[PDB]
Design a protein around this ligand. Structure first.
Ligand SMILES: NC(=O)c1ccc[n+]([C@@H]2O[C@H](COP(=O)([O-])OP(=O)(O)OC[C@H]3O[C@@H](n4cnc5c(N)ncnc54)[C@H](OP(=O)(O)O)[C@@H]3O)[C@@H](O)[C@H]2O)c1
Ligand SMILES: NC(=O)c1ccc[n+]([C@@H]2O[C@H](COP(=O)([O-])OP(=O)(O)OC[C@H]3O[C@@H](n4cnc5c(N)ncnc54)[C@H](OP(=O)(O)O)[C@@H]3O)[C@@H](O)[C@H]2O)c1
Ligand SMILES: NC(=O)c1ccc[n+]([C@@H]2O[C@H](COP(=O)([O-])OP(=O)(O)OC[C@H]3O[C@@H](n4cnc5c(N)ncnc54)[C@H](OP(=O)(O)O)[C@@H]3O)[C@@H](O)[C@H]2O)c1
Ligand SMILES: NC(=O)c1ccc[n+]([C@@H]2O[C@H](COP(=O)([O-])OP(=O)(O)OC[C@H]3O[C@@H](n4cnc5c(N)ncnc54)[C@H](OP(=O)(O)O)[C@@H]3O)[C@@H](O)[C@H]2O)c1
Lengths: 257, 257, 257, 257
């Protein structure tokens, strides 16, 4: 999408997996990309070099987004480096762990809820004034894209009740954000991955992987690369200017939304 | 519903509104009802007397369910009083306040999320072994019924982004609970009120109420009493023994689920 | 439900299965029931006698509802017999046959679409003035309840693409009916069975049945009797007076709606 | 998307409106486009010239898709012209007319159902062997994209009950098609317009247009041009290769799916 050249794109949880594949694609489109994780990954500067060689720009920011303080600092550091924000991608998140209902204590509850919900709510909040300002300047829309999940539709797997429901929370809160912040020139959409071959599912044996694939019409897990184009699509005003408040599931037909 | 006579029914947030109307109906059906709120209503003993006159029993327990410890204590007190639990109704909840996204800070976030999510997760967790034991003893199912919202479908109203999304969270977490606790003899279902004439909407002026009613095919707010039968329906093994993991919206056609 | 005594209840496809189980329950509640099928069951008079012994009344009408003329005639005959209509249950329907997409020709298409859609649309159309008149006379609501399907959510099974989509059609058309006929005093709701042990699934071998049951949290097919109480619930103004435009899935957790 | 160059794209109902805008964009991507309507529009050869000058190719085919014979002939003529099919877009359809439930006769019913359902089912059926053959040859996927509607979610408007439910039927039938034809190398997705400024809404007065816009967060109708990129996205194997069985609503936030 030609209108992504020069766009300032902050992608949380882009140190690996879906976020990283997505960041790579934005850089190829000429975007200025904020790479993010809890820790700087090894060879982060190689990644930055690849992204620059593809015609974009990149910088890494470390933050554990479970606290609002880290969310505000991430936004501030990103704006300090690139001068504003056109696109926020709330992709940071994960299972944290697996605990069945009888085992859910406050510590685990807090960990899952902070990683998956507080992170998105607060990072979006802090980014919002910047996204709105960029929209006003261009006369076109800025974009928030959050990563959902198949689990936000049908429920979390074993020990993952809080995770699935946290994703359902995101699917819903976007609806409120559309209703009252469309007037700020910001579109909100969600990419909802199914079962994707990343670190997220690395613990699964081939036997478990085969059983899941049996319930997927395409008969396989997705790749991180198969998630990325949807993010660019939702980020592009030319592509999706009249699209807001939607969830797009990418899952080989596993769940039909 | 003849199989409700003698059933031990804990109803959170039954000190007033929908929870109270529901409690009154369970008592008419001969159930032993746990009444609950943050504070005792000024005429709680008259409510209890009326429920007993109607052929049931009642006892009041005060607890702020925003903390796990309070949820555990409520369940323990209820079990000490009536000897077990057959039905848990997770009805405690509310807006807490109205704050737009820019004004959503940690303290407010925590308040809404604890009141609406942690309360349900923890009360259900602590009630579960009792519910499972009652099901095993009877060879029939126990029931968890949680109060959702139209907002859990379409998003929270102004300043209610977290509230709407918290209800979406409940709608989703029930799906995980069904998948892995159906084997424990417990059915999980949701009653999802639309716009209902309780203290929840007491702050709405006449013109605002009428604006909302314009989007309701039945042309009016619902009553607390119009919510109550669905709760008894989901609680009754005879009525709904093969029904679990469902959300039933009661809203005069305002949202069609 | 005490307000069902004397109610005039036309139940299409009540000669067997879910419709029959439902009819029996209405008669136990004291309703006057219109029994219906394409052919009289070999022991229809014994069914009628049992319904009368239970405190209700019943009369059988034969009609193939694939044509509008037959739908009009059924409604007229029912009205001639019982003097009006308080509740219409659109339960007649079925697969007709199983043909994969490449084998879906005009004749098969017409057969499935007429049996499952035209039947519902036209029977409801012809019943509507009577339902409206009954509501006007009582000052309470009349009820239309249509039988949907899990398939109307997730898609038809092998060779059943048109059937699943026909049920989706029903789920949707009710929404239009609510928007513009709530003012006529009629509530429209749907009972959506999952996998139920009737003639509908009589062609399924034991290994196919247990394979489906593996995807059902309750681990078994439902019974016709487990469907029936929901129909009475939706028919009862006292029970569901503020409920309209809803779909209630009865499926042991197989699909969570 | 670079992988759309040379692709053979049959777009039903592309003589005007959304279908036409979509066709124009495919031609700009270098695709070979089958333009279609009931009648050759005036200046159709100018349109073909514009599309060729943009680096694509085009030919027009006349067919009323209400009959299976016309659907087969359209597919045959398209394949005769371009040698195969890579992408089918089922965009032909419309209200036909507005008749409230009491006014729905067989002729009107048949008209709406044939135009909106039989057309899609039969055209897809006839295209399927070609789409499958093209997928086998390339080793990638072919695409079917059907035009849905906001009405397929929330119901048809005044006199449009059958139209809304016909769109709901399409949303559902695609699910069956995914389940059993993903193995044929074909992906099926839906673009679901909200309120778009085409001939579809040309009858609406300024007053009515303003009141509808009030329920749209973006505060305006969409344009045909705002629908087009989503079709290209769903047609591109590179963009959406792991996406199948999805509905994407394009409606300025009017309905949040
Ligand atoms: N994979 C799937 O099948 C699937 C399905 C549905 C949804 N998702 C969602 O997809 C998104 C990306 O996950 P993935 O599959 O790409 O797995 P991944 O490889 O583990 O990536 C997760 C990313 O989130 C970051 N992150 C996690 N917790 C964080 C925290 N508290 N603060 C800041 N950053 C944090 C991680 O940073 P570090 O490098 O510091 O750990 C990492 O960059 C997640 O939101 C996940 O919920 C994945
Ligand atoms: N009314 C509607 O239109 C509507 C619509 C959708 C959903 N709902 C839901 O329906 C449920 C009942 O509310 P209502 O409409 O009947 O309003 P209500 O009159 O305010 O009742 C709410 C009940 O929840 C209790 N509660 C609130 N916060 C609590 C806490 N932190 N800990 C323990 N108990 C708490 C209240 O006790 P106290 O009075 O002692 O604080 C009260 O008994 C709520 O979950 C609400 O979210 C209502
Ligand atoms: N069983 C399940 O798992 C399941 C699941 C989802 C939905 N459903 C729906 O449940 C409803 C009842 O079916 P069931 O399971 O009870 O199976 P059933 O025993 O085959 O009952 C179907 C009833 O519909 C009548 N019928 C069929 N075609 C008709 C026509 N063209 N005109 C008039 N009446 C017609 C049948 O009459 P005759 O016997 O005289 O032909 C019979 O009374 C159907 O709408 C079905 O689609 C069933
Ligand atoms: N506009 C909206 O707001 C909106 C919203 C939701 C869904 N849609 C859907 O969008 C699609 C395109 O409509 P539009 O808005 O672009 O309106 P449009 O300008 O009227 O386009 C409709 C197209 O469908 C063709 N068509 C209609 N009936 C046909 C038939 N029986 N056989 C063959 N072709 C037929 C028409 O051909 P002719 O030129 O021969 O008439 C025309 O090319 C339709 O499926 C409509 O249901 C539109």
């Amino acid at each position: 999408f030609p209108d992504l050249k020069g766009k300032r794109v902050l992608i949380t949880g882009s140190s690996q997996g879906i976020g990283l594949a997505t960041a790579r694609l934005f850089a190829r489109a000429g975007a200025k990309v904020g790479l993010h994780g809890r820790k700087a990954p090894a060879n982060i500067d190689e990644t930055i070099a690849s992204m620059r060689a593809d015609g974009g720009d990149a910088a890494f920011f470390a933050a554990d987004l479970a606290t609002s303080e880290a969310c505000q600092q991430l936004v501030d550091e990103f704006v300090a480096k690139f001068g504003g924000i056109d696109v926020l991608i709330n992709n940071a998140g994960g299972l944290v762990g697996r605990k069945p209902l009888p085992e859910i204590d406050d510590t685990f509850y807090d960990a899952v809820m902070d990683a998956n919900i507080r992170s998105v709510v607060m990072t979006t909040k802090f980014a919002l004034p910047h996204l709105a300002a960029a929209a006003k300047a261009s006369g076109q829309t800025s974009a928030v894209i959050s990563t959902g999940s198949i689990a936000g539709h049908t429920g979390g797997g074993p020990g993952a009740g809080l995770y699935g429901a946290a994703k359902a929370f995101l699917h819903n809160v976007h609806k409120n954000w559309v209703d009252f912040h469309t007037k700020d020139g910001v579109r909100f959409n969600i990419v909802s991955p199914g079962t994707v071959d990343t670190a997220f599912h690395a613990d699964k044996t081939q036997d478990v992987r085969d059983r899941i694939s049996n319930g997927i019409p395409m008969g396989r897990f997705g790749t991180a690369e198969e998630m990325a184009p949807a993010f660019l699509f939702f980020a592009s005003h030319l592509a999706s200017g009249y699209i807001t408040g939607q969830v797009l599931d990418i899952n080989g037909g596993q769940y039909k939304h």
